[PDB]
């Protein structure tokens, strides 16, 4: 059967958000850094690239909505 898209588990999201926020002034992981995140999260490098693309634009589009999340991290 075809693989279905799925929301990432809480674990993967925490790892990605951790990296994103710790590099907030320039959240652009290098290819080697995307491979390691991909490993810790159990996802693919394309998926890490998609997550960062999605995160930067949505965060940039709504700074307020992502506040508080910026702090806990």
């Amino acid at each position: 059967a075809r693989r279905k898209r799925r929301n990432f588990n809480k674990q993967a999201t925490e790892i990605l958000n951790e990296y994103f926020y710790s590099h907030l002034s320039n959240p652009y992981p290098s290819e080697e850094a995307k491979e390691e995140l991909a490993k810790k999260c159990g996802i693919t490098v394309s998926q890490v690239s998609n997550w960062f693309g999605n995160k930067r634009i949505r965060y940039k589009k709504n700074i307020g909505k992502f506040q508080e999340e910026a702090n806990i991290y």
Partner: protein
């Protein structure tokens, strides 16, 4: 604070994205399989036929080759 300040930004003069139609997509896909690399003339004819600029056609083919790369990387684990 503006933490997004140093991030990559789209130049305020970039053409706004226009999804192509099922028809334009299907026709471009068929031109792709005929020759994965366009000649100045084939590009010119496909562009006219679909009412897309030659630039848009050149870029569509470039993006299509990157999609092929993406799919093949997804397969050869």
């Amino acid at each position: 604070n503006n933490p997004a300040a140093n991030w990559l930004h789209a130049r305020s003069t970039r053409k706004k994205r226009c999804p192509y139609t099922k028809h334009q997509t299907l026709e471009l896909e068929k031109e792709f399989l005929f020759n994965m690399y366009l000649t100045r003339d084939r590009r010119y004819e496909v562009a006219r036929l679909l009412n897309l600029t030659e630039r848009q056609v050149k870029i569509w083919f470039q993006n299509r080759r990157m999609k092929m790369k993406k799919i093949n990387k997804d397969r050869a684990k």
